[PDB]
Amino acid sequence: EDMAKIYGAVAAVSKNVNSSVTYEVKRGTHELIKVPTIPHNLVLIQSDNGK
Amino acid sequence: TSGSIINHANNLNKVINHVFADKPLISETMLKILTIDGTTGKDGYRNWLD
C-alpha cells in the first residue's frame, strides 16, 4: 500500500506535462460592407425656353 | 531560473496533495513531531521533503 501511494505520486508529476496551445488569429480583421449605389452629385439646370 | 522554480513548486504540491489523500502515507507519529512547532502537519511534511 505504501508503494502504491509512492508510485501514484510519481505518476502524478509525470502527467503534469503540457502538450500544445490553441488560439485564434483574428486581430487586424474587420468586417466589410457593400455600397449598392454610386454617389454621383450631378444636377441638370435648364432654362424655361431651353435656350 | 524562474521555470525551474515554478516547476518544482507545482510538483511539490501535487505530491503533497496525493500523499495526504485517503489513508495518509505518513504516520500520525511523525506528523506530531512536525506539528510540535504549531505548523500544520501537511505544511511541515512539505518543508521536510524539500
Structure annotation, total helices of chain A:
1
Provide the β-strand percentage band of chain A.
under 5%
Largest interface: A-B, 9 and 8 residues
How would you name the oligomeric state of the polypeptide chains in this document?
part of a larger assembly
Q: Main beta sheet of chain A: strand number and arrangement?
A: none
Radius of gyration of chain A: 37 Å
User: What is the tally of beta strands of chain A?
Assistant: 0
Shape category of chain A: rod-shaped
User: Approximately how much helix is present in the residues of chain A?
Assistant: 25-40%
> What string gives the helices and strands of chain A in order?
H
* Secondary-structure content class of chain A: mainly alpha
N-end to C-end Cα span of chain A:
113 Å
Explained architecture:
This is part of a larger assembly, with two copies of chain A. Chain A has 51 residues and is an all-alpha fold. Chain A has one helix at 2-14. The A-B interface holds A 1-2, 5-6, 8-9, 12-13, 16 and B 10-11, 14-15, 18-19, 23, 25. The PDB classes it as virus. The entry lists the keywords reovirus, capsid protein.
Q: Characteristics of this structure?
A:
1 helix; 2 chains; rod-shaped; part of a larger assembly; 51 residues; mainly alpha
Quick gist of this model?
This is part of a larger assembly, with 2 copies of chain A. By secondary structure, chain A is mainly α.
List the helices and strands and how they pair.
The structure is cut from a larger assembly and holds two copies of chain A.
Chain A: H1 2-14
